Amino acid sequence: SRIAKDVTELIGNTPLVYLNNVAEGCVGRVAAKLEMMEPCSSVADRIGFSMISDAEKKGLIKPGESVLIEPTSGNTGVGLAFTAAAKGYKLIITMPASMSTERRIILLAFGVELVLTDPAKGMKGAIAKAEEILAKTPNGYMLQQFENPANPKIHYETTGPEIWKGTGGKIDGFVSGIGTGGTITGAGKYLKEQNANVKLYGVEPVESAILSGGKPGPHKIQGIGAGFIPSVLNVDLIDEVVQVSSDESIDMARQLALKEGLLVGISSGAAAAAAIKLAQRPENAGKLFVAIFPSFGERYLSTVLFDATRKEAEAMTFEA
């Protein structure tokens, strides 16, 4: 046992816990890959560092000399934020003035030069500014979590293995929600390379199931269902696409807290419902599914996920 040179040696090597009370009635088992345990409690912590580490080894960027830029409103902002933090990188994350003031604090806290755009233009208003700021900045650098290959690479070298070596090769199916598609692909390719019978089940919002023939729509399952095929996503690897609604996802994310003591984000719930539904198909008795729980639930107190219990809060008045 030794001391890590810095916060970045702490990335990866996340734990595997079974689902007990929620998997009621399954003939199969479901192990949860807890990315919430990542240093900044998110799976993005892998692509954040990965993409930087990579552009570094390639010699395309150098601390303070280069100026990382990146369009995103989700966790990769944080995964990048703390990696740029320890490695001394000026960072600029573009996102509409819409995203909570908290997701703004967290990056500010990391010295992230967050730049807000028109909260009506959505992602385009962000990427515009993003791209803009790039063409504008001499030594600016666009990471592009959806295009960059370091993304699935990292998953091919760690998440992939971690899962394999975790289940000791007995893994029967890999369940993952598709955001940039990096995880499912990267880690996915590596398992298939260790066993072709391994099944990669893709998960996406029922309300925005594009890989199911459906049309992109808005949903609450924050973190996946980008409404399109990220270049890094290699759909051919997917053996099946399970769809889940923002509602099951939510509910499931809640049962997870009250029955497993796993406080997780709504994307994790969805990945879990998916995994349990599969575990219940008769023909899968005895099989092992590994579902990725992408984030911790504390970074969602200000979201649809907590509105319910949130009233139970402010409302309830003190007792004497």
Per the annotation, where are the binding residues? 75, 179-183, 267
Nearer residue to ligand AA5 within complex by CB, 64 or 212 = 212
Give the side-chain half-sphere CA count within 13 A for 229: 11
Q: Decide if 94 contacts 130 (C-beta within 8 A).
A: yes
Q: In the bound complex, what is the minimum distance in angstroms from residue 2's beta carbon to ligand AA5? A: 29
**Of 288-307, which residues contact ligand AA5 (CB under 6 A)?**
294-295
Closest CB to ligand AA5 among 289 and 296? 296
Q: In this complex, which beta carbon is closest to ligand AA5, that of residue 123 or of residue 280? A: 123
Handedness of CA 42, 44, 48, 53 (dihedral sign): positive
Binding mask 131-160 for ligand AA5 (x = CB under 6 A): --------------x---------------
Task: Kindly tell me the sign of the dihedral angle through the C-alpha atoms of 222, 292, 182, 244.
Answer: negative
Answer whether 77's CB lies under 8 Å from 103's CB: yes
C-beta of 178: minimal distance to ligand AA5 in Å? 5
Q: Which residue is nearest to ligand AA5 (CB)?
A: 74
Q: Provide the residue type at 66 as one letter.
A: S
Task: With residue 85 as reference, give the H or E element that holds it.
Answer: helix 76-86
Residue number with CB closer to ligand AA5 (98 or 280): 98
CA-based torsion, 220, 232, 50, 160: positive or negative: positive
Query: Judged by CB, which is closer to ligand AA5: 155, or 284?
Result: 155
Considering only residues 39 to 98 of the shown chain, the ones binding ligand AA5 according to CB under 6 A are 42-44, 72, 74-76
Minimum distance from residue 268 beta carbon to ligand AA5 (Å) = 7
- Give residue for tokens 């980008």: 226
Query: For residues 60 and 89, is the Cβ–Cβ distance under 8 A?
Result: no
| Main-chain dihedrals φ then ψ at residue 294, nearest 5 degrees | -50, -30
Q: What is the DSSP letter of 307?
A: H
What mask of x and - would describe binding to ligand AA5 in positions 168 to 207, judged by CB under 6 A? Answer: ---------xxxxxxx------------------------
- Provide the binding-site residues for ligand AA5, judged by CB under 6 A: 42-44, 72, 74-76, 145, 177-183, 223-224, 226, 265, 267, 294-295
